[PDB]
Amino acid sequence: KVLRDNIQGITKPAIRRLARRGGVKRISGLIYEETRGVLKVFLENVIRDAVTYTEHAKRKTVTAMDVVYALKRQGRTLYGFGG
Amino acid sequence: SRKESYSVYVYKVLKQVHPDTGISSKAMGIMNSFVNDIFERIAGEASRLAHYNKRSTITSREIQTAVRLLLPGELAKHAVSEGTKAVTKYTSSK
Amino acid sequence: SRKESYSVYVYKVLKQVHPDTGISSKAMGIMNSFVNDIFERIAGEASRLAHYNKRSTITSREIQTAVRLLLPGELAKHAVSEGTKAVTKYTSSK
Amino acid sequence: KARAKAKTRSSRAGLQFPVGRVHRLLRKGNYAERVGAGAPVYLAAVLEYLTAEILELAGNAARDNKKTRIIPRHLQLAIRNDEELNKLLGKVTIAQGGVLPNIQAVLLPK
Amino acid sequence: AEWAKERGIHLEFSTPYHPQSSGKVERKNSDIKRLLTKLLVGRPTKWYDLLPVVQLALNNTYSPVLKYTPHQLLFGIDSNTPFANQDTLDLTREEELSL
DNA sequence: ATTGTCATGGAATTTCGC
DNA sequence: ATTGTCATGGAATTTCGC
DNA sequence: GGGCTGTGTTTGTATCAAGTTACCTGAATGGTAGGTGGGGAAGTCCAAATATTCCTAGTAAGACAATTGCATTCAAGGCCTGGCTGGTGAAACCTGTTTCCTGGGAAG
DNA sequence: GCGAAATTCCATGACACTACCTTCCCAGGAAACAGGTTTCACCAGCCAGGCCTTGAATGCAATTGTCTTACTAGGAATATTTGGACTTCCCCACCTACCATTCAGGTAACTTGATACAAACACAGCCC
Ligand SMILES: [Mg+2]
C-alpha cells in the first residue's frame, strides 16, 4: 500500500517540540528540511535491518522484538518492549 | 505458552528496601528488560572471555571479570563484593 | 605450536585480480585480522539468529541473513550473489 | 517413597533472584558447554545488586514527587541522576521517559 | 481438487504407503534417472539444461517388446528426428488413422 | 470406493539355405 | 581371502482308537 | 501595579494492580556415577626492561612581525508570538479476515 | 474307516545407522491487525508585526607564527639481566547426564484494594 507525502507528516511544531526537549531556545526555519532528512536516514537503517529478521523467520508481521533486535544491532538498545 | 521472566523476583527485591511501594506494569517490563540485557552483557562478555583463554568453562571467576568490565567505578566495587558474599554463603552450605 | 591463519588464502586471491602484485608482512596481518573479525561478525550474528528462532542449526540460509545485515547497500547485493554461485556450484558437485 | 525437603538454591545463598533459572540460561544459550555450579549463584547476586540500585534510586524519586508506585519517568530520572549508573547505560534509551530538566544557562531571558 | 474439477479431471489416488500402485510413473522415473544419469557423467549436474532432451530422447525410444515409438502410438508418425521411419510414407494418412 | 512395470541380456526358439 | 535365518501360523501329515 | 501560567490540594472511580489460590505442569531438586576438563607444579627458553652513552635532532626559547581575533557599532533580516481557521488525528466501537502459532498430524 | 487328535511342514518376512523436510491440513483461538465508521476537540497550518539576533564592516591589540640558537633527551644499539608466558604432565572434583519426586510459578480467576487521573478553585512565583 502506497501513501506518499508522509515525510511531510513530521509537522513544523512537532519538530519544534522535539527541539524544546533537547534544550533549544531559538531555531531556524531550515532545520525542518534537515530533520526530515536525518530522520529518514535513521529509518532506512532500522527497517532495512528489521525486515531481514522478519523475512528470515518467514513472518509477515514485523513484531516488537524485531525492531529491538535491529536497534540491538546498531548499538542503541531499547528497553521496555522486550529483548 | 510459557514466557519466563524476572517479574516475580523484582517484588522480592522491591519489598526489601521499600516495603510500602508498588510498581506499575509498564515499569516492570523495564526492570524485566533491564535484567535480560544486563544478563547477556555479563554472560556475553564472560562467553568471549572463554575463547580468549582457550577454556570451555564459565567459572565463577569469569563472571567476576565480566562485571569489573561492564560496571564503571563505584558499582564495580560493590557488585563484586555483593557477589562474593552470596557465594561464600552458598558454598559453606550444601 | 600451530597458529592457524588466512594468510595463504590471500595470495590465492591477490594473484587473481592483481597477478603482478606482492603484499607486505604487516599488511598481511590486517587482511588476516580483517577476516577473523568479519568472520565472527557474520557467525556471531548468525549465532544469535539461531536463538531468535529457536533452532540449534546454522543453515546456509542464516549466513545469508547475517550478511544482509552487516554489509551495507551495494556490498549486500554482490556478496549474496557471490555466495549462491559458490553453493550451487558446490551442491551440483559431489 | 518420599524424599527430603527440597531447599531451593536461592534460599541456600541468601539471594532473591533464582539460581535454578539462571543455570538453565547458561546451558541453553550456548554460552559454553560446561557451566560451574557456582557461576549462576554468583551471577544471580550481581543481577540482584543492580536491581536494587536502580530501585533504591527509583524509590527516592517516587517519594520526592509524592508517588506510591514507580512509573518509568522515575526510572528515566533515577538513571542519569547517578553518574556511574549512567555510564553503564550511556547508549540506552529508556522508553516513555523524556529527558532530565536542563538549560545551558545562556538562553535565560533578557 | 478444485482446479481438477474445472478441467474434467477425475483424480485418482493410490492406496497410502503403496508406491507400487502408481505403475508407469515409478517406471519412467527409473528411466529419467537413467537418461539424466548417463548424460551427466563426469560433469556438474546441470540437469535443467537437459530436460528438453529427455522428453525427446525417451519419447523416441522403441519399446523393445512392443516395437514402436511413443510418438507413433501417441500421434501416428515420426516427427523430424534422426532415424525416423519411411515405412509409413508408402501409405495414405487419411486411411492409416484406422490402421 | 482401487490394481506394478518394463527395459534388458543370456538363452531358448524359429527361420531357412541348400 | 568368505556364506542368511529362524520364529510362526494355516495346512498338510501321521497317529491311533476301536 | 497587574497578570498569566504553572502548581497545588481534595474527591471519586475506574482501572490497574495487588492478592490469594488452584492446579499441573514445568521445572526444580536430590542422589549418584562417570569421565573430562582444568588446575596446579615444573622447567628451558623467551621477551622485555634496564643501565649506558652517544650523538643528534628537534625541543625550547627569545625576538619579531602581521594577521587574526575580538569587541563595538551598524544595519536589517529573520524568527518568535499570537489571533484564527479548519482538517486530521485520536479515541471509542465492530469485525472479518488474516496470520500465526506452536502444536500435532499425514505422506512422500 | 472316519474322525479326532497329536505332529511335522514350509513359505515368508523382517532385521540391516536414522531424523528431517516439504507441503497441506487441522484447529482453536486469538491476535491484533488491517479495515472502516464516528465524533469531538486539538494541534497544525496561516499570516504579520515587532524586536532581537546575526552578519558585516572595522580598527586595533596581542596573539600567534616564524626564524634562529643553545641545548636536552630520545632513540638506538648493547650487553645483560631479569622476569614470565606458555608448553607439559597428571589427577581429582566438579559438572553433567538421569529419573523420580515434589514444589513453585504462571496462568487464571474472582475479589479486592488502592492510586492515579481528571476536574475545580485557589495559591504562589515570576515576569511585563
Ligand atoms: Mg512419490
mmCIF file of C-alpha atoms (C1' of nucleotides) in Angstrom, chain B residues 1-2 9 11 15 22-26 54-57 59 94, chain H residues 16-19 24-28 30 37-39 101-103:
data_model
loop_
_atom_site.group_PDB
_atom_site.id
_atom_site.type_symbol
_atom_site.label_atom_id
_atom_site.label_comp_id
_atom_site.label_asym_id
_atom_site.label_seq_id
_atom_site.Cartn_x
_atom_site.Cartn_y
_atom_site.Cartn_z
ATOM 1 C CA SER B 1 2.657 -20.897 26.233
ATOM 2 C CA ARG B 2 5.197 -20.075 28.934
ATOM 3 C CA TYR B 9 11.903 -11.679 41.506
ATOM 4 C CA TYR B 11 8.801 -7.909 44.105
ATOM 5 C CA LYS B 15 9.798 -5.376 49.125
ATOM 6 C CA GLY B 22 4.065 -0.865 44.426
ATOM 7 C CA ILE B 23 5.299 -0.872 40.849
ATOM 8 C CA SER B 24 3.367 -0.475 37.641
ATOM 9 C CA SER B 25 3.030 -2.939 34.788
ATOM 10 C CA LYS B 26 4.888 -0.901 32.164
ATOM 11 C CA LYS B 54 41.024 -21.244 25.452
ATOM 12 C CA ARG B 55 38.735 -22.800 28.027
ATOM 13 C CA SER B 56 35.290 -24.299 27.543
ATOM 14 C CA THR B 57 34.370 -23.438 31.127
ATOM 15 C CA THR B 59 33.687 -20.399 36.131
ATOM 16 C CA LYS B 94 25.069 -27.739 50.955
ATOM 17 C "C1'" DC H 16 -4.679 -1.251 37.206
ATOM 18 C "C1'" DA H 17 -2.504 -3.761 40.209
ATOM 19 C "C1'" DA H 18 -2.237 -6.309 44.406
ATOM 20 C "C1'" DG H 19 -3.988 -10.621 46.495
ATOM 21 C "C1'" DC H 24 -0.326 -29.080 36.955
ATOM 22 C "C1'" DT H 25 2.859 -28.998 34.748
ATOM 23 C "C1'" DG H 26 7.004 -27.488 34.084
ATOM 24 C "C1'" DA H 27 10.705 -27.225 36.196
ATOM 25 C "C1'" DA H 28 13.470 -27.549 40.081
ATOM 26 C "C1'" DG H 30 18.094 -34.672 45.360
ATOM 27 C "C1'" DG H 37 38.379 -30.569 31.929
ATOM 28 C "C1'" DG H 38 41.023 -27.774 34.253
ATOM 29 C "C1'" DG H 39 44.134 -26.567 37.721
ATOM 30 C "C1'" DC H 101 1.378 -20.338 16.325
ATOM 31 C "C1'" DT H 102 3.068 -23.503 18.367
ATOM 32 C "C1'" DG H 103 1.404 -27.856 18.034
#
